A paper describes a structure:
The zinc-dependent metalloprotease meprin α is predominantly expressed in the brush border membrane of proximal tubules in the kidney and enterocytes in the small intestine and colon. In normal tissue homeostasis meprin α performs key roles in inflammation, immunity, and extracellular matrix remodelling. In contrast to meprin β, meprin α is secreted into the extracellular space, whereupon it oligomerises to form giant assemblies and is the largest extracellular protease identified to date (~6 MDa). Here, using cryo-electron microscopy, we determine the high-resolution structure of the zymogen and mature form of meprin α, as well as the structure of the active form in complex with a prototype small molecule inhibitor and human [name]. Our data reveal that meprin α forms a giant, flexible, left-handed helical assembly of roughly 22 nm in diameter.
Unlike small molecule substrates and inhibitors, which are not sterically occluded by the helical packing, we investigated the inhibition of meprin α in vitro by murine [name], a 42 kDa globular protein. Remarkably, we observed no significant difference in the inhibitory capacity of [name] between oligomeric and monomeric variants of meprin α indicating the oligomer does not interfere with binding. Molecular docking analysis of [name] to the meprin α oligomer instead suggests a compact, intercalated packing is possible that is not impacted by the helical rise of meprin α. We therefore imaged meprin α in complex with human [name] by cryo-EM and generated a 3.7 Å resolution reconstruction. Indeed, this structure confirms the intricate packing suggested by the molecular docking analysis, albeit with some degree of flexibility. The presence of a conserved interface suggests the oligomeric nature of meprin α confers a selection pressure on [name] and supports the notion that meprin α oligomers exist in vivo. Indeed, structural studies of human [name] in complex with meprin α are consistent with crystal structures of murine [name] and meprin β73. Unlike meprin β, these inhibitory complexes were observed to form supramolecular helical packing as a result of the intercalated arrangement of meprin α and numerous [name] molecules.
Author numbering:
A (entry chain E): 66 to 600
B (entry chain A): 31 to 74, 79 to 214, 231 to 257, 299 to 310, 324 to 361, 366 to 382
C (entry chain D), D (entry chain B): 66 to 307
């Protein structure tokens, strides 16, 4: 589906304008979409500085782009309701040079178009293009493509699909709007000769005996084992025992020796391209509560020698022994190495150790709040429609307390998951400006794949706004101070706002696919940051 | 029409007579000064349509001085804008005649004055609702009626006014007078009311072609389309002569505004049209 | 409130002209104001002798200055009734690149402007400036500033202030016209790199056992005690037992 | 005690080399002294980049500097024990055109020199310079000065002071090695026209009713009192009810 003519290629970074007819929510969502391109491809963007060809993003009627670089510079429309990252990513792929997937030359080998079900005067949007207009980039037809069309596209009757896959399983998959597909990224890379990406700095699942070029300290007391998932009941997080002889992870036994013995696992040197990074990883602390996993940086001391230790975050044992997720904000602007110390604590009271797998290091903010829900498939069966779970209260960078309500079974539709944000009262509220005028919620159901290019994390975006109101609060703003306007919960000793978000954030039959429930449990990321500065 | 460079030497000569004729028609307000030719377009002697960018001099039109005899206003006092005009010059008969005009003027931006000089007297919307302007002009007149008693005088009309508040209220005024019928002079004056003591000052100085003038408020719209006719519409200038030479003339629709614009008499953006 | 651009600075002494349209009183008061600059700062003034930039002082309409050095040379007006030293000092501070205090970028944090009480067409006199045009010279907003407007500045109603301090006590103090404030001198010194001043040659309050580098003779008979104010009823003049 | 000739004045930042013969302790002590200069004056330092004059700091014999900017660039030495911050500061004040305080022209009004108690061969280290060579910077002689020598300097007998203050209290004070004195900063600032320290960004003690240009929010519920230190136990920290 790529436009064949190489004169239609951009040259990076794509210079852009956000037109002030865009809502703040759209401006923030566009920048967030640019971050996903930079995190999965060598595509990059920059503010406009007088260049010949550029993208101006605007809020016109509907949501659309011209295909490829138009050398005079070009519009993208993100009409109201198109804010969600996948729609923005779809239209930016049009500007990068990609036509719709069901417009491939060979499409008819892979899909059925039920022409008589299309609205009259829309059937031309389903035209197929010849091989002189378009390349396949030597890739198969991809039903998972973000460039594909949903079954119910331009259709007369809401019960009847326009388009269905010839392999009937993919009827349930065509026109996903999670993210870029794996093949969409491969095509984008093949079009623009990408190999790296600007915002994945490192990742490691320990799969090779090379341990991703990590090393071990010798000034420490002992070593982490590069441990095989073949031992009974001790599975790594990458494969979870799904494959014999192939799951690998680092393990630091605390069951023997003295207290306060330690091992350093230490990365290969990294050359950060941004001032901030998020070190994601998965870990277990099955050993004594007094065991410590301490994350460190070793950074350039400014002589070009990477020897300056900086303790960044300490993870401590809890009653839970299942795989936890960690995110550590690093703030490295000079070359460095991320380090894990494990500290033995009371081996006379440890039957276990510290474990690491599925490390990822992105040059991004960290998710501002992270919620895991355990045994989520068992929860999803046990829960009645319109029952809820609530996250513990996160704080944003500005000190607003917030949370998420998960309704595992939507009362609004069968087989859908509802997920909604709320502000929570918290220790800072008294000084914060109220209502929450322009903070931009991004909620993401994490796809648990270490490699960020293998991730299709579902995400939805809104900006807390003055327009958000209810008669339940006397038609006042939902984002006013939660002690005034929310409802009390002894469940965390908080007030919580009326919640806002999405009935059917994702269907169950979508959520069961990919790595969204990898260890039979659900992971939700929340960000909630001010976007007033985009105005 | 032959569009004429704004620095064309015959146009530069024509502009000074056209401006003098514009002042000659004006029977109230202040003598205008050329800042710079900004348009000149010629029908074929020679008939010119013009745009002149212009300032205000310190002389009222009832004063007998020619515009070349007078000075420019100080930055904070400034009024400026555009005069659009229609004027003819016959080289054999040495004829110099404005037919018509429209002039739009503004004071200098009261913000940009305050940005340049904070205590500079900011100009006032001219009306009788400013009771302190009436008090200033009547006090300065009353002072002059005590400084001299060989004659006595009455306030005819307040023309230009500004005020300032650095010592308490300070007001500055210009106004026409007649004796205690037609005016006899223009007087400047001031009133400064400190809490413990007034201060008063005064000066007294003593003394057509169809068009329009407007002093608009600050932060140049103008109209002069004497015909819509693409073939042109008739005019006559044959009354200028002692003998019946055939000197009917044509006006076409007003021409819209590389040797342009002309060099400014004052280049400051405080007194410069866009 | 200082004009940031360092091209707008003077180089001392400021060359000046007193025009003859100034009354004798105004000429004399301007020289007295220079003696205050020369006494409280390294600012100095000289009679004009052919310099490219200079100040000419004139009795025009009202009392005003362009801000900072205009390199062609510039007018200060001192109109009738503006003879008092503090008004001259305020205008000379404008020529020395200062704006009014209530025109600081941050002023809204320190003063209320009652816009509806300002006379029509006089709202601009209360325009603030951004931090690109002006430095704070790393100094707080100073209500006691000579540049600060009086509470009743450009007001519609003589009973009602245009401008009031958000710290209500300073309603009574904003637009003092005694003298330079301590912070106005601090800002003038930070602007013009002053440390000494031309006309304060010494001072001493004895608060330091060094006694201001005073010494005691030995061809005299005895010594003055450096007497401590602790003894009852026998205090110093600097602090008067405070 | 400052060298009068203005050519001898540095132009900031003073470019510096640290020689590799310096220990780490001496290199780090030098950079720590620079932080004190930057913190208490407009004196600034930069690494060397080929400039005509510069300081090179050295671990040569003894701890010494040429006085003022030698326009070829100059050695300073920092021998053993001169790693102390105040001794670096003293040598950098020599580099910044300052002579010892007991070498002032008027020093004999303030300190006795016991020539008889000086080691033979070292009396010249108590020479005093005439006022054509040095300014007073209109400052008193300062016993608290970092440029002053302690009582036991160059002495024959360890128990017997070479130099003593004529005000006898100051025998317990002269030649302090704490820091710059307030007059050493006053001098340094008069010498280099420094009005603002590079690193003192703000300070406040609330002694003034404008509370150092702090403000109180309105989003909050309430306000902090600006409290008068008058109540029985509730004193300020600046003055402790003194
Ligand atoms: C020894 O360590 C156990 C827990 O660690 C586990 O057992 C060891 C023997 C080894 O097998 C380790 O590898 C393994 O991880 C400690 O037991 C824990 O004690 C705490 C404090 O009393 C208990 O916390 C409370 O838990 C309740 C909920 O049950 C909460 O309401 C409370 O707020 C509080 O958090 C915790 O339940 C308990 N955990 C278990 C699994 O027993 C034990 O204290 C420790 N002994 C010593 C001497 O340190
Ligand atoms: C990704 O890699 C591609 C190769 O795999 C690049 O394609 C090559 O780009 C060259 C220009 O940079 C082309 O050269 C030009 O070719 C045309 C005919 O196609 C000639 O008329 C031109 O004269 C010639 N240019 C010059 C200066 O002579 C190569 O032909 C072309 N190769 C192929 C196989 O198409 C892509 O450009 C590259 N993409 C990016 C974004 O860098
Ligand atoms: C008060 O002291 C200041 C230092 O603390 C002086 O500021 C320095 O003035 C220098 C000129 O005398 C400036 O040098 C010029 O800088 C500009 C860029 O800003 C360059 O284009 C010029 O090339 C350069 N001049 C030359 C000859 O190369 C310094 O930049 C400037 N330093 C700082 C930190 O501002 C003030 O001039 C002084 N002011 C007064 C009123 O005394
Ligand atoms: C600290 O501020 C001082 C003013 O308070 C500055 O002193 C002025 O320096 C000028 C040179 O930069 C001197 O100009 C010279 O004057 C003599 C006559 O006195 C002439 O022969 C010279 O030709 C002339 N030089 C030039 C280039 O024109 C000023 O006379 C002098 N003023 C005073 C009162 O001393 C200091 O320079 C300044 N020092 C630093 C380090 O910032
Ligand atoms: C983007 O679309 C807009 C909306 O059509 C274009 O804006 C105006 O479009 C009409 C028709 O082309 C023109 O008459 C106006 O002059 C256009 N104004 C501007 C500011 O462009 C716009 O041209 C389109 N393209 C770009 C690159 O902005
Ligand atoms: C949309 O498609 C559905 C499925 O074919 C149609 O559903 C039928 O609706 C009628 C009543 O209108 C019922 O009698 C049939 O039993 C329904 N069939 C099924 C299989 O449920 C529906 O009518 C279509 N609507 C339109 C407007 O075409
Ligand atoms: C200071 O103000 C006077 C006000 O009179 C300015 O002088 C007038 O300037 C204009 C333009 O140059 C002339 O047309 C007048 O003839 C001048 N009048 C007088 C009495 O000289 C003067 O230009 C202003 N600026 C300076 C630096 O003096
Ligand atoms: C000027 O301000 C004063 C004070 O606010 C006004 O005084 C009020 O006048 C009315 C009668 O006109 C009285 O009923 C009120 O009691 C007065 N208020 C006070 C606080 O004394 C005055 O009217 C205003 N005048 C104008 C012209 O604005
Ligand atoms: C250093 O000076 C002290 C004081 O002048 C000398 O001490 C005295 O020495 C005599 C003998 O010569 C004793 O009788 C005294 O009792 C000492 N006085 C004190 C205060 O102890 C000392 O001798 C000198 N030493 C040198 C090496 O010069
Ligand atoms: C999850 O399932 C396991 C059995 O596989 C059970 O032991 C455990 O208690 C469950 N945990 C939760 C949080 O429900
Ligand atoms: Ca693994
Ligand atoms: Ca090890
Ligand atoms: Ca004595
Ligand atoms: Ca408050
Ligand atoms: Zn599309
Ligand atoms: Zn002023």
């Amino acid at each position: 589906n790529g436009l064949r003519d190489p004169n239609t290629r951009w040259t990076f970074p794509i210079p852009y304008i956000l037109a002030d007819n865009l809502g703040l929510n759209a401006k923030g969502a566009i920048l967030y979409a640019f971050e996903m391109f930079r995190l999965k491809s060598c595509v990059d963007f920059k503010p406009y500085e007088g260049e010949s060809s550029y993208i101006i993003f605007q809020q016109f009627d509907g949501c659309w782009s011209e295909v490829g670089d138009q050398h005079v510079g070009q519009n993208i429309s993100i009409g109201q309701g198109c804010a969600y990252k996948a729609i923005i990513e779809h239209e930016i792929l049009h500007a990068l040079g990609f036509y719709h997937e069901q417009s491939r030359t060979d499409r008819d080998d892979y899909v059925n178009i039920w022409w008589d079900q299309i609205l009259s005067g829309y059937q031309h949007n389903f035209d197929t293009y010849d091989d002189s207009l378009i390349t396949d980039l030597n890739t198969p037809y991809d039903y998972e493509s973000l460039m594909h069309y949903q079954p119910f596209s331009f259709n007369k009757n809401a019960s009847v699909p326009t388009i269905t896959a010839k392999i009937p399983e993919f009827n349930s998959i065509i026109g996903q709007r999670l993210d870029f597909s794996a093949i969409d990224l491969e095509r984008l890379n093949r079009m623009y000769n990408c190999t790296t990406t600007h915002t994945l700095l490192d990742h490691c699942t320990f799969e090779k005996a090379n341990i991703c070029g990590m090393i071990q300290g010798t000034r420490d007391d002992t070593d982490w084992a590069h441990q095989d998932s073949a031992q009974a009941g001790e599975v790594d997080h990458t494969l979870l025992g799904q494959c014999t002889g192939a799951g690998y992870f680092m393990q630091f036994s605390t069951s023997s020796g003295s207290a306060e013995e330690a091992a350093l696992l230490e990365s290969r040197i990294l050359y950060p391209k941004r001032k901030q990074q998020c070190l994601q990883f998965f870990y277990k602390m099955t050993g004594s509560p007094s065991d410590r996993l301490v994350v460190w940086v070793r950074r350039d001391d400014s002589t070009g020698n990477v020897r300056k230790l900086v303790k960044v975050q300490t993870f401590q044992g809890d009653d839970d022994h299942n795989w936890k997720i960690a995110h550590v904000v690093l703030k490295e602007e000079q070359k460095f190495r991320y380090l894990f110390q494990g500290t033995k604590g009371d081996p006379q009271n440890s039957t276990g150790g510290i474990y690491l797998d599925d490390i990822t290091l992105t040059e991004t903010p960290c998710p501002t709040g992270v919620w895991t829900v355990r045994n989520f498939s068992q929860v999803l069966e046990n829960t009645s429609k319109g029952d809820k779970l609530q996250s513990p209260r996160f704080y944003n960078s500005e000190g607003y307390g917030f949370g998420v309500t998960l309704y595992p079974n939507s009362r609004e539709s069968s087989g859908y998951l509802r997920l909604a944000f709320h502000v929570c009262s918290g220790e800072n509220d008294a000084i914060l400006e109220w209502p929450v005028e322009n903070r931009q919620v991004i909620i993401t159901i994490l796809d648990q794949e270490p490699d960020v290019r293998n991730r299709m994390s579902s995400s939805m975006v809104f900006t807390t706004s003055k327009s958000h109101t209810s008669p339940a609060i006397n038609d006042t703003v939902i984002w006013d101070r939660p002690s005034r306007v929310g409802t009390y919960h002894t469940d965390c000793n908080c007030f919580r706002s009326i919640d806002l978000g999405w009935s059917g954030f994702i269907s169950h039959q979508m959520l069961k696919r990919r790595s969204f429930l990898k260890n039979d449990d659900l992971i939700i990321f929340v960000d909630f940051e001010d976007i007033t500065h985009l105005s | 029409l032959l569009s004429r460079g704004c620095n064309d030497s015959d146009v530069l000569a024509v502009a000074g007579f056209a401006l003098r004729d514009i002042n000659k028609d004006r029977k109230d307000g202040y003598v205008l000064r050329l800042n710079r030719v900004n348009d000149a377009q010629e029908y074929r002697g020679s008939l010119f349509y013009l745009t002149l960018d212009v300032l205000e001099t310190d002389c009222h039109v009832l004063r007998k001085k020619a515009w070349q005899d007078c000075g420019m206003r100080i930055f904070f006092e400034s009024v400026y804008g555009q005069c659009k005009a229609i004027f003819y010059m016959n080289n054999p008969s040495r004829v110099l005649y404005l037919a018509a005009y429209n002039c739009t003027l503004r004071p200098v931006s009261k913000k940009k004055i305050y940005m340049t000089c904070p205590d500079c007297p900011s100009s006032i919307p001219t009306d009788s609702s400013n009771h302190q302007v009436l008090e200033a002009a009547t006090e300065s007149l009353a002072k002059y009626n005590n400084e001299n008693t060989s004659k006595q005088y009455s306030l005819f009309k307040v023309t230009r006014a500004s005020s300032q508040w650095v010592v308490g209220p300070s007001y500055f005024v210009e106004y026409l007078i007649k004796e205690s019928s037609v005016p006899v002079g223009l007087c400047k004056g001031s009133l400064t009311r400190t809490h413990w003591e007034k201060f008063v000052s005064v000066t007294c100085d003593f003394f057509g072609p169809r068009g329009s003038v407007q002093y608009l408020p600050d932060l140049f719209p103008v109209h002069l389309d004497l015909t819509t006719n693409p073939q042109g519409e008739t005019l006559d200038i044959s009354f200028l002569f002692l003998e019946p030479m055939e000197e009917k003339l044509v006006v076409l629709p007003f021409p819209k505004e590389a040797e342009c614009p002309g060099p400014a008499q004052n280049a400051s953006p405080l007194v410069l049209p866009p």
